[PDB]
Design a protein around this nucleic acid. Structure first.
Ligand SMILES: [Mg+2]
Ligand SMILES: [Mg+2]
Ligand SMILES: [Mg+2]
Ligand SMILES: [Mg+2]
Ligand SMILES: [Mg+2]
Ligand SMILES: [Mg+2]
Ligand SMILES: [Mg+2]
Ligand SMILES: [Mg+2]
Ligand SMILES: [Mg+2]
Ligand SMILES: [Mg+2]
Ligand SMILES: [Mg+2]
Ligand SMILES: [Mg+2]
Ligand SMILES: [Mg+2]
Ligand SMILES: [Mg+2]
Ligand SMILES: [Mg+2]
Ligand SMILES: [Mg+2]
Ligand SMILES: [Mg+2]
Ligand SMILES: [Mg+2]
Ligand SMILES: [Mg+2]
Ligand SMILES: [Mg+2]
Ligand SMILES: [Mg+2]
Ligand SMILES: [Mg+2]
Ligand SMILES: [Mg+2]
Ligand SMILES: [Mg+2]
Ligand SMILES: [Mg+2]
Ligand SMILES: [Mg+2]
Ligand SMILES: [Mg+2]
Ligand SMILES: [Mg+2]
Ligand SMILES: [Mg+2]
Ligand SMILES: [Mg+2]
Ligand SMILES: [Mg+2]
Ligand SMILES: [Mg+2]
Ligand SMILES: [Mg+2]
Ligand SMILES: [Mg+2]
Ligand SMILES: [Mg+2]
Ligand SMILES: [Mg+2]
Ligand SMILES: [Mg+2]
Ligand SMILES: [Mg+2]
Ligand SMILES: [Mg+2]
Ligand SMILES: [Mg+2]
Ligand SMILES: [Mg+2]
Ligand SMILES: [Mg+2]
Ligand SMILES: [Mg+2]
Ligand SMILES: [Mg+2]
Ligand SMILES: [Zn+2]
Lengths: 50, 86, 135, 134, 122, 105, 52
RNA sequence: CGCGACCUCAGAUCAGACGUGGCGACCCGCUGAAUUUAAGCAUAUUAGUCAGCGGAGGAAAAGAAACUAACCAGGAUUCCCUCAGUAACGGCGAGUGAACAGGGAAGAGCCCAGCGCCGAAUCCCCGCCCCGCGGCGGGGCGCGGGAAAUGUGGCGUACGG
RNA sequence: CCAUCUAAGGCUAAAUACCGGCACGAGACCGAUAGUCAACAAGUACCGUAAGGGAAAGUUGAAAAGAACUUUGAAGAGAG
RNA sequence: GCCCGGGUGGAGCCGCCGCAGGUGCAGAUCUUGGUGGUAGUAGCAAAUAUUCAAACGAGAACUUUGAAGGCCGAAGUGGAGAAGGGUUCCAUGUGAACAGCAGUUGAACAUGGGUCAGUCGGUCCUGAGAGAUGGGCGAGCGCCGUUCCGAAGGGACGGG
RNA sequence: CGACUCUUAGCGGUGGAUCACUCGGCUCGUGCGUCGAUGAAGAACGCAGCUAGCUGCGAGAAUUAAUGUGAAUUGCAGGUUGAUCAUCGACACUUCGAACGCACUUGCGGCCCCGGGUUCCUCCCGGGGCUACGCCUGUCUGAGCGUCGCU
């Protein structure tokens, strides 16, 4: 919706910022077990609640 | 009609985000949170669901002040003094 | 008295629990009054209370409260016990003279139900298994 | 046999403490023995390793009589790197091979003021212990 | 090159604020340089300027509150910041004087009949 | 259902007895703690008797035990007065005193 | 359940009997050797040394 | 009518304090079922238990007899062993069910109102001076203010005074 | 007739309780379908409007020494 | 049930006398996980329709351009909004996975960008209604009630 | 013979059993036994040169000061008068939240004091400090054909 509240817009902004993939220098640290970002969300699949 | 066809009509929401507990349980028409009962002074907590009690109990969050007092206690709440300088 | 807060009658269950409007509260009206005064004045401590008048539909009690943070009592050795944190809400925990009467506290053959702290304590002590290490 | 009730002998607890010790405990843990000459001179048996002490490698594929200067101490990996022990990888670049300090002996120390303070303290404590043992 | 808190203590507030302003403008220049593309040497300095700003602010606040409580020590009523900060329960206990004083009846009793040290033969 | 022959039993396990069960796995630790407290108090009161104040001779109040003699709660005021001991000084010099007990004999 | 019967009690006379039997059997070379102890050089198996 | 006391009751962003909410294993006060057992079931039982409400502490509650007993008498409370699956209750069916004495752990006793006697001999707060003040106290000076005789303090409480 | 207390006001530590919290010690216990639901970015992902429901998932190697270089293919992918 | 031989494997294991148990599976429309025949089978058939040439490219029935023939036919398969979605918008790049054929293409993936207000709305008013205080009730969290058992105005021309 | 099918073995797939490991649980015990209007528990949003999650932290934002220690952190860069770690007593601690000017859109105020406009003469802009309910002691201002006293 074009009409939206400030807190809704802020929550959307945080969720959008969280959706990037991991930096390529992570996976080759020493004590690392992370292969990829498993929390990525697609707008078609999962609908953010709300 | 009562199923798939009816599922298309839902386009206005019943709940929104609570200002106290943060969950999406603030009933707008009743103006009341269904998880913490926000307008009430006391938080909503029934002990017929230990899982719900343990989901948002004291040990779950930042503990940004209780964590500090836990270690202040180990010195008798020492205050107003500093270690000897070099 | 106290009638059962149930929708119309409908105290669903066996007939022994069908009573509605002949039941009696376990605490006295004096204790109820003390607890109401204590709840309204949360910064004071309830000491005692007494009866001053009654009619068909009301009972009137005057209750003594003490401000625990006033110097006039905090500097007096023999009344500073009430300023201790242990004595918060005596009327709510049934520790005043009027509240104690309903707990069945006493000494002798008339008060075996409350050997120990209270009814809760006596029931606990009587209703556990002492499974010793050796048996 | 351990009799102190406040120190544990549990394997899992000891391993957890060892693998999550902070850096200033890592410094203590990665200590290596002195050579015979240094031991006789300073009356001290072991010393935590520093950045540019030199070493004889005693155990492993690289054991030998070569004095090697340590280049840097990787405390996260519980390892030190010696300027001579190394191997070449596929592309030809040479990388250092990790050696644990416990399999390492110092030839001579880097005498900093803190180092000599530590040495004198260790020697004094050992000597007073021996005198009490007399 | 390195700003330390040891030598900032003797200085007074004016030049401390001036140095804080210089650090702030340097930090702003560092940020704009980072956005427009700068050397890794300039990128790394951002943390050191931030920490220097933190040190200056900490010294300012420490001296200010030290002076404030030194000035207020001689007064009956203090600000809540300067009042002792322990647990809420311990803040409202009886103090040492009103915890120690005794009624003179008990004073009389313990004066007349004190505890005695004694032993009995086997 | 009853078997061939045996005793009729009335086990009192028709409540939620498994929630209120008192295991005694802390019995040795309790004994150790009581001991330590006992010796701590004994050291605290340096020359005084460890057991405490002396107590009096009493007869057990029952046909089953009236032939036996116990240790009582404390000496009574008649005995203290006829022995020339002040009721307030007896407690501080080590004599247990109670005012409830009478003296019929 | 934690309230299993972990501990057992034995009669004091039986405990003393077991102790006496063990002490008596410790004095026989055949039984001590069959226990696996190497005592072929021991001068006398009820081995007693002074209080020094 | 006016002026002045007292009583009762208001108003304050008046000066200085105090409560709220959380956790809730253990504790205290209420409210409080039905599954189940009875080979059915309504009294019983589950059970004064679950759920619900309120209030604390490091422990809580209880506590120094308007007691137990009937003995040649014991002597606050609390906890363990035993009394005892006993006395007793119960469609006397299913089932339920203590206490005294005895041995131990621990052990500690006290204070008001009243009755009376002391020139209210009592208490709180504001100002100045001196001490240390990070648990706001001690001493002095104030023809400083107030509380209080519709009763503050000392003596004194069933063991007598 | 006897016996025993003195109600309708108040304070009081110790012995006692403790599946929450802080910090510890141990075990004839379980050993990744077990043991807490959770050994791992677990009350996480995800589902439901909501009350609420709720996983799967440990192991290269001593050391990355993690396969330079040549060759076919667009590449995945192969041969040396 | 077990003992040897051979192979793989890379760090612990067993015999005897006792002790203890969460101690032996073919089934429970058993629980979890894995894999078959069916089977390269059913099927990829609602709304008339595509064709020629060129370019790019390893690769073209599906991409792009041009040409032709068609459909929607203004109550549209057009142009804009509300609710809802929340970056899906735009440019560049990729073709591992997805788009139930394919793709040089995409609402896919990867890098970056993009929403500018005194006048457009919110913000203000009150509607149906919701909801404090006073009061009442309530063991109690609280509930009823909205002018009703209230000392309910902190405002003002002017004058001193 | 050839195909197909069946059986057994070798090898290779598919799958992830078994075994061996265990910074995790479960159970028992011990000492302590501490939250909050000086703003708790909880939630939201932000903070790293390269940072999504987890963790840590709060516009001083993967941390400041102080003390102890004594040469690192590390995935890549950059740069002993004390690097890094630990301890933690100084300081600081955004928005909601009992949540406190009124409401919950972050909308609308009021009062006092400062800095800009002014050169206070008022607006306007920015900054700072207050503005919740109940209740206790005292102070001030009051009300009453309530009980009185003098005129
Ligand atoms: Mg959808
Ligand atoms: Mg609650
Ligand atoms: Mg009841
Ligand atoms: Mg009565
Ligand atoms: Mg030692
Ligand atoms: Mg049979
Ligand atoms: Mg039989
Ligand atoms: Mg049946
Ligand atoms: Mg039936
Ligand atoms: Mg019934
Ligand atoms: Mg019942
Ligand atoms: Mg309950
Ligand atoms: Mg509370
Ligand atoms: Mg507490
Ligand atoms: Mg108590
Ligand atoms: Mg008495
Ligand atoms: Mg008794
Ligand atoms: Mg028997
Ligand atoms: Mg019958
Ligand atoms: Mg019963
Ligand atoms: Mg008894
Ligand atoms: Mg004893
Ligand atoms: Mg008097
Ligand atoms: Mg009395
Ligand atoms: Mg009494
Ligand atoms: Mg009491
Ligand atoms: Mg042990
Ligand atoms: Mg396995
Ligand atoms: Mg594996
Ligand atoms: Mg291995
Ligand atoms: Mg087992
Ligand atoms: Mg099977
Ligand atoms: Mg086909
Ligand atoms: Mg359209
Ligand atoms: Mg369009
Ligand atoms: Mg697009
Ligand atoms: Mg496809
Ligand atoms: Mg314009
Ligand atoms: Mg209402
Ligand atoms: Mg085969
Ligand atoms: Mg971030
Ligand atoms: Mg520092
Ligand atoms: Mg340092
Ligand atoms: Mg609005
Ligand atoms: Zn909520």
């Amino acid at each position: 919706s074009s009409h939206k509240t400030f807190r809704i817009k802020r929550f959307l902004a945080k969720k959008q910022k969280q959706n990037r993939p991991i930096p390529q220098w992570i996976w080759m640290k020493t004590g690392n077990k992370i292969r990829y970002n498993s929390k990525r969300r697609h707008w078609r699949r999962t609908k953010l609640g709300l | 009609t009562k199923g798939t066809s009816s599922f298309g009509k839902r386009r206005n929401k019943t709940h929104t985000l609570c200002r106290r507990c943060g969950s999406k349980a603030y009933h707008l028409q009743k103006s009341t949170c269904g998880k913490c009962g926000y307008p009430a002074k006391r938080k909503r907590k029934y002990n017929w669901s230990a899982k719900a009690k343990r989901r948002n109990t004291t040990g779950t969050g930042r503990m940004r002040h209780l964590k500090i007092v836990y270690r202040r206690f180990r010195h008798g709440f020492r205050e107003g003094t500093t270690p000897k300088p070099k | 008295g106290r009638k059962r807060p149930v929708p119309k009658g409908a105290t669903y269950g066996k007939p022994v629990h069908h009573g509605v409007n002949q039941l009696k509260f376990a605490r006295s009206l004096q204790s109820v009054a003390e607890e109401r005064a204590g709840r309204h004045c949360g910064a004071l401590r309830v000491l005692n209370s007494y009866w001053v008048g009654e009619d068909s539909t009301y009972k009137f009690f005057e209750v003594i409260l003490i401000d625990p943070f006033h110097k006039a009592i905090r500097r007096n050795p023999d009344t500073q016990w009430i300023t201790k944190p242990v004595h918060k809400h005596r009327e709510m925990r049934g520790l005043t003279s009027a509240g104690r009467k309903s707990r069945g506290l006493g000494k002798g053959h008339k008060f075996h139900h409350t050997i120990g702290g209270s009814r809760r304590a006596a029931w606990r002590r009587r209703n556990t298994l002492q499974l010793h290490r050796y048996r | 046999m351990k009799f102190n009730p406040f120190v544990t002998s549990d394997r899992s607890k000891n391993r957890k403490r060892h693998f999550n010790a902070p850096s200033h405990i890592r410094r203590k843990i990665m200590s290596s023995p002195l050579s015979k000459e240094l031991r006789q001179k300073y009356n001290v048996r072991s010393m935590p390793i520093r950045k540019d002490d030199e070493v004889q490698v005693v155990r492993g594929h690289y054991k030998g009589q070569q004095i090697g200067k340590v280049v840097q101490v990787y405390r996260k990996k519980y390892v030190i790197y010696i300027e001579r022990v190394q191997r070449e990888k596929a592309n030809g670049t040479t990388v250092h091979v990790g050696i644990h300090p416990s399999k390492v002996v110092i030839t001579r120390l880097k005498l900093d003021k803190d180092r000599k303070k530590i040495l004198e303290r260790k020697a004094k404590s050992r000597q007073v212990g021996k005198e009490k043992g007399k | 090159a390195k700003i330390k808190a040891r030598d900032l203590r003797g200085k007074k507030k004016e030049e401390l604020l001036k140095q804080l302003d210089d650090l702030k403008v340097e930090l702003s220049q560092l940020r704009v340089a980072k956005v427009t593309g700068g050397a890794a040497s300039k990128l790394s300095k951002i943390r050191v300027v931030r920490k220097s700003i933190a040190r200056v602010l900490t010294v300012i606040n420490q001296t200010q509150k030290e002076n404030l409580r030194k000035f207020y020590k001689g007064k009956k009523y203090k600000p809540l910041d300067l009042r002792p900060k322990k647990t809420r329960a311990m803040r409202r206990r009886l103090n040492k004087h009103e915890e120690s004083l005794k009624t003179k009846k008990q004073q009389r009793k313990e004066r007349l009949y004190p505890l005695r040290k004694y032993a009995v033969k086997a | 259902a009853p078997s061939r022959n045996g005793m009729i039993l009335k086990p009192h396990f028709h409540k939620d007895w498994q929630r209120r069960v008192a295991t005694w796995f802390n019995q040795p630790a309790r004994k150790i703690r009581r001991r330590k407290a006992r010796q701590a108090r004994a050291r605290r009161i340096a020359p005084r008797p460890a057991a405490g104040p002396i107590r009096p001779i009493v007869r057990c109040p029952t046909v089953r035990y009236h032939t036996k003699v116990r240790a009582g709660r404390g000496f009574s005021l008649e005995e203290l007065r006829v022995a020339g001991i002040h009721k307030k000084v007896a407690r501080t010099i080590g004599i247990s005193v109670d005012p409830r007990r009478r003296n019929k004999s | 359940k934690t309230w299993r019967r972990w501990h057992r009690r034995v009669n004091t006379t039986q405990k003393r009997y077991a102790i006496c039997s063990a002490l008596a059997a410790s004095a026989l070379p055949a039984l001590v050797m069959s226990k696996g102890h190497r005592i072929e050089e021991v001068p006398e198996l009820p081995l007693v040394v002074e209080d020094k």
